[PDB]
Amino acid sequence: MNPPPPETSNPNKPKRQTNQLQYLLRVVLKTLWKHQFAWPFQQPVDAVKLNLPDYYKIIKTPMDMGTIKKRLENNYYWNAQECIQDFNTMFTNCYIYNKPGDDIVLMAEALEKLFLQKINELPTEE
Numbered sequence: 338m339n340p341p342p343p344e345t346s347n348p349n350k351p352k353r354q355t356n357q358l359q360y361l362l363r364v365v366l367k368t369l370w371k372h373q374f375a376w377p378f379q380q381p382v383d384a385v386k387l388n389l390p391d392y393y394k395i396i397k398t399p400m401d402m403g404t405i406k407k408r409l410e411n412n413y414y415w416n417a418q419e420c421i422q423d424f425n426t427m428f429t430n431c432y433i434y435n436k437p438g439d440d441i442v443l444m445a446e447a448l449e450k451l452f453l454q455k456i457n458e459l460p461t462e463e
């Protein structure tokens with residue numbers, strides 16, 4: 338079965354607005370979200386629906402853009418690096434579970450390339 342999705346709010350953490358965090362939502366996340374190959378990454382992998390019984394045996398740190406989007410909207414992240422790390426985990430999971438040349442791997446590669454193009458212009462830390 339599926340685990341609960343990653344937490345998207347933290348009642349026990351203070352919250353702040355920053356140019357970097359707002360950029361990660363409105364520019365980085367928004368641009369990847371609208372890419373033709375974003376769809377397999379817009380929500381947690383549903384291993385029951387997809388019939389992938391070993392997915393959560395292999396992937397113990399799941400992550401997806403739907404979670405990242407909610408985390409940004411909810412001010413879950415204090416440091417911009419926390420968000421960048423979540424994107425990295427999402428891509429790395431894909432490379433762990435799947436094989437070279439799989440459709441999903443090509444889709445991750447396109448997204449990851451776009452991600453690097455967008456974080457290139459991340460505002461400086463304040």
Ligand SMILES: CCc1c(C(=O)Nc2cccc(S(=O)(=O)N(CC)CC)c2)[nH]c(C)c1C(C)=O
Nearest residue numbers: 376377378380382383386387430431434435441
């Ligand atoms: C290859 C399986 C996979 C997906 C994926 O999402 N594939 C998917 C395929 C068909 C339907 C649905 S779906 O029914 O859940 N669906 C309707 C279209 C989405 C709304 C999802 N994502 C990742 C990161 C992986 C892996 C294993 O790395």
